[PDB]
């Protein structure tokens, strides 16, 4: 049976389970169950399922080299699918809440959940809460008797937290650290001294790479009972590295990919985000160019946004991107090689993850 | 050593632990650690600690009748304090998010967190996320080798979820169920057909009683390794019952307690909430009074709010409250008696919980 169809079948299964449990144990009525069904579908479906599918892909790699009864292979694949949906639901939680936090308008070519007429922010914040609560309901139900349950829940928990930390780094990335203070309204940085590669790296590592790369890979290992086939430090390193590249690409697209293709109108410049474009620009600009950057970044005025974009064009950031890209290929390929020592199979799964990222 | 001081000491311990871990494992800088310290203090401190202290109180009851080495008694009390703080942090998560959801202005005589000048909703939503993530960080760290860890995390998870469900019942309680639809903006009910005791009960059971009464009681049992000293169905029933009473009192105060004493200006009438006052009023009004209620409820206009309040005065709701109160005393005392069969000690802890609620 093909992996994607198995994965989508399991969504329907897990959906039915969660809604049936709301009726039998939580006293839900049909109309509220309907609203939650539609919330779940709208917030969890329609992407590429790259995160969940990585759990399945890793488990399939192991199945191909490990002896098991057929019923065990099915169990492992079902577990990978459930684990994959936990990640997808974790993402949906973060996307719902982030869109509210950021006043985002669209995502993937549709309105952000909170903007649905019959949702509103008052409901949507809570809907996002439910989303993450469902990850745990899934885990406890499907993995109740599993040897890996503890390690799975502990990892999930750590990833969730790292992600929330990352969110905090992101949202505060345009303020001067020395000025953070709950009592005082936060000015945007005037010097941009904290737009550095190391600071950027910190934001990305926490905000995206743990839930997007580290969690799918490690979850695949846990449901396969294969965590002793790998050097966990290598898995972290390669996860963090591919995750960074993925975020740089997202940053480039924010600015340069036409909105109908992006799925949204990118506002990193108006939001004064610490983007790869801004850090790399500030890494290579002269005095005049910096000054011009400072006079125009982080302002809604389209004229000012256009100055910033011109600055990035003229600064020939494509060349820095290509050099960064070349470095990431060396390092990712080196890490893949190191992974081959203890597991060629897992190395290959990582190689796949990298190809899908590198040319997407 | 007195329970409250032990509990507050443990807050400082757990705080230091979480911030020290952010520095050593999450790459936090001092200024962000400072912001999180201030967020934690502002959102977790200053209430009566009734929820956390119930965990400690239950554990102390058991310690008085159970043989243990001194070091075990200290371990159990430390565990109760940590467990108690998990509940307090869970509450803080919900209060932060609820205040944002509801556009609340104050709570406990201070601005809602999101309204702090240097916070804002964009940060505050995430701060609330961190709050709940810290419950799990606490659990995994302090309870790592504990026999009760699984049962504690599963219970916590279920309570969290019940609470989020309850939030959904609450926020939707002024809409007609048959009209809920993410695609369509939600009108307020014109008939108030869903303002019934059973519907009200559902909202309260989920939104408050699981995290306010059931979780502290059961957590106390788990850290004491005492869950076989009780009939769990009785614990649920008494929890749900005292929790309901607690919410009715809160509802009465929303409307009638002067704002400097309430800590906030109550807006249940303008928010068109399904309050005990509104359900009980609709339970006893004549046609004319209902009609008047319908023309004035759920409107910001102070004139209209004042009509509703007059209606409640003239309807002599104090008498229904006293009769409800009398019924709750019978039922709570009956349940306490039933609890005495398997544990007089636990019965007494529940008796305390009830006294603190009944005359607060
Ligand atoms: C993650 C991050 C943040 C900011 C700037 C960069 N760019 C680079 N980082 C590392 N090597 C690089 C480059 C550009 N060329 N080469 C060789 C990376
Ligand atoms: C939880 C709830 C919701 C709505 C109305 C009520 N009131 C009552 N519920 C039960 N017994 C009652 C009363 C009033 N008198 N007596 C005897 C309770
Ligand atoms: Zn964001
Ligand atoms: Zn982006
Ligand atoms: Zn609320
Ligand atoms: Zn209230």
């Amino acid at each position: 049976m093909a992996s994607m169809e198995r994965f989508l079948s399991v969504y329907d299964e897990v959906q039915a389970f969660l809604l049936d449990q709301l009726q039998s144990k939580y006293e839900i009525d049909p109309n509220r169950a309907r609203y939650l069904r539609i919330m779940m579908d709208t917030t969890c479906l329609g992407g590429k399922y790259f995160r969940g599918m990585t759990v399945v892909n890793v488990a399939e790699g192991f199945l191909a080299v490990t002896q098991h009864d057929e019923a065990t292979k099915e169990r492992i694949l079902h577990d990978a699918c459930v684990g994959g949906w936990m990640i997808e639901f974790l993402q949906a939680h973060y996307l719902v809440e982030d869109d509210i936090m950021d006043g985002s308008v669209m995502r993937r070519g549709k309105p952000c959940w909170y903007r649905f007429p019959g949702v509103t922010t008052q409901c949507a914040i809570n809907d996002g809460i439910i989303l993450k609560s469902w990850t745990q309901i899934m885990a406890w139900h499907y993995f109740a008797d599993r040897p890996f349950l503890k390690d799975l829940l502990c990892l999930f928990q750590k990833v969730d937290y790292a992600t929330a930390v990352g969110q905090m780094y992101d949202v505060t990335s345009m303020c001067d650290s020395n000025k953070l203070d709950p009592e005082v309204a936060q000015p945007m940085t005037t010097d941009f001294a904290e737009f550095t590669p190391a600071i950027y790296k910190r934001i990305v590592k926490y905000k995206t790479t743990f839930y997007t790369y580290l969690l799918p890979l490690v979850m695949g290992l846990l449901v396969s009972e294969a965590a002793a086939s790998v050097e966990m430090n290598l898995v972290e390193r390669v996860a963090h590295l591919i995750g960074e590249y993925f975020q740089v690409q997202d940053d480039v697209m924010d600015c340069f990919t036409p909105p109908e293709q992006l799925g949204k109108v990118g506002t990193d410049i108006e939001d004064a985000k610490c983007s790869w474009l801004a850090v790399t620009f500030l890494g290579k600009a002269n005095a005049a160019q910096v000054a011009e950057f400072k006079a125009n970044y982080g302002e809604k005025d389209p004229a000012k946004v256009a100055v910033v974009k011109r600055l990035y064009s003229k600064a020939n950031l494509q060349a820095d991107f290509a050099a960064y890209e070349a470095e990431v290929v060396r390092e990712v390929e080196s890490l893949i090689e190191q992974l081959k020592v203890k597991s060629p199979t897992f190395a290959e799964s990582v190689a796949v993850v990298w190809e899908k990222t590198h040319k997407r």
Side-chain angles (χ1 to χ4, degrees), chain A:
Chain A
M1 155 175 224
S3 295
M4 177 64 71
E5 288 81 8
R6 174 189 308 263
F7 187 63
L8 297 170
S9 302
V10 173
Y11 176 85
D12 282 7
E13 175 187 1
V14 166
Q15 183 176 89
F17 171 80
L18 297 169
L19 297 172
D20 290 10
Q21 189 195 249
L22 287 156
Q23 184 207 67
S24 86
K25 299 191 196 330
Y26 292 86
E27 298 172 28
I28 206 164
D29 54 284
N31 282 295
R32 286 177 183 73
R34 181 173 44 81
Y35 174 106
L36 287 177
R37 183 177 63 56
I38 295 159
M39 188 266 284
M40 183 188 307
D41 290 354
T42 307
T43 62
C44 303
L45 301 182
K48 297 194 276 178
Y49 310 113
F50 156 89
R51 294 166 190 78
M53 292 292 297
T54 295
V55 187
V56 172
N57 290 334
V58 165
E60 298 176 301
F62 288 107
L63 284 179
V65 298
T66 310
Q67 299 190 322
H68 299 289
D69 283 345
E70 190 62 24
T72 307
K73 300 178 207 217
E74 294 287 312
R75 183 192 93 221
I76 291 172
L77 292 163
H78 194 271
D79 289 350
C81 290
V82 171
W85 287 109
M86 293 174 64
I87 308 191
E88 293 294 323
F89 283 47
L90 185 65
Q91 173 173 62
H93 157 85
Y94 276 109
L95 302 182
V96 165
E97 303 298 349
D98 192 49
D99 285 337
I100 299 163
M101 291 162 55
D102 295 346
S104 296
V105 175
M106 305 261 275
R107 104 142 50 218
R108 259 198 254 98
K110 308 180 38 158
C112 302
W113 182 240
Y114 80 96
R115 299 184 58 254
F116 281 50
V119 177
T120 83
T121 297
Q122 176 185 47
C123 292
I125 288 169
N126 197 71
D127 293 337
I129 294 172
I130 287 166
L131 289 160
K132 190 157 63 187
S133 311
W134 278 339
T135 69
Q136 308 305 282
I137 303 298
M138 280 175 227
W140 286 98
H141 174 74
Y142 295 96
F143 302 151
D145 71 38
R146 295 287 193 276
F148 58 77
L149 175 64
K150 175 190 242 261
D151 284 341
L152 191 144
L153 288 172
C154 185
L155 163 72
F156 195 87
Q157 177 285 110
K158 281 173 203 288
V159 167
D160 181 28
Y161 186 56
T163 309
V165 177
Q167 284 284 89
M168 182 208 204
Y169 293 154
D170 199 43
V171 289
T172 61
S173 60
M174 73 293 307
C175 298
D176 293 341
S177 291
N178 57 287
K179 296 332 169 102
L180 294 171
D181 182 350
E183 295 292 318
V184 177
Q186 302 282 298
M188 180 181 36
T189 188
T190 55
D191 64 20
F192 296 86
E194 300 185 48
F195 278 38
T196 69
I199 290 166
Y200 177 76
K201 281 168 161 138
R202 181 184 72 166
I203 299 169
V204 174
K205 174 177 185 189
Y206 294 93
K207 94 149 169 224
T208 329
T209 73
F210 281 90
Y211 91 84
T212 296
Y213 289 93
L214 177 68
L215 182 67
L217 291 172
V218 180
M219 197 162 296
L221 295 169
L222 294 179
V223 302
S224 296
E225 299 246 85
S229 302
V230 315
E231 195 69 64
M232 192 67 65
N233 290 336
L234 290 181
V235 178
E236 297 186 21
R237 281 160 63 202
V238 75
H240 294 319
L241 189 59
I242 300 173
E244 191 181 279
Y245 180 81
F246 169 75
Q247 191 58 59
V248 172
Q249 292 174 302
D250 182 294
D251 288 0
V252 171
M253 299 184 325
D254 196 272
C255 182
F256 287 111
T257 295
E260 82 291 336
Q261 179 160 17
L262 198 65
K264 62 187 179 144
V265 168
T267 60
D268 289 351
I269 294 166
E270 298 89 314
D271 297 341
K273 300 311 289 300
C274 186
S275 71
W276 180 96
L277 295 165
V279 173
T280 298
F281 172 86
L282 295 172
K284 89 192 275 190
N286 65 35
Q289 293 170 301
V290 173
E292 190 164 33
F293 176 96
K294 289 172 179 181
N296 290 275
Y297 198 64
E299 297 280 316
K300 208 145 279 295
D301 183 343
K304 297 190 176 189
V305 170
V307 168
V308 171
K309 293 204 193 200
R310 184 85 58 74
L311 281 172
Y312 291 169
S313 287
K314 292 183 195 152
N316 190 213
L317 303 186
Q318 331 78 17
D320 305 82
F321 179 84
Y324 169 71
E325 181 179 3
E327 188 48 24
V328 172
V329 169
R330 286 171 57 81
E331 291 177 305
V332 175
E333 293 179 6
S334 182
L335 288 166
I336 293 164
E337 290 296 301
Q338 293 280 19
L339 280 161
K340 291 166 170 184
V341 170
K342 299 190 171 198
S343 190
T345 300
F346 184 71
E348 178 51 25
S349 292
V350 176
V352 166
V353 160
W354 172 238
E355 294 174 57
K356 290 169 176 187
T357 304
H358 183 215
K359 32 108 258 161
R360 77 183 164 89

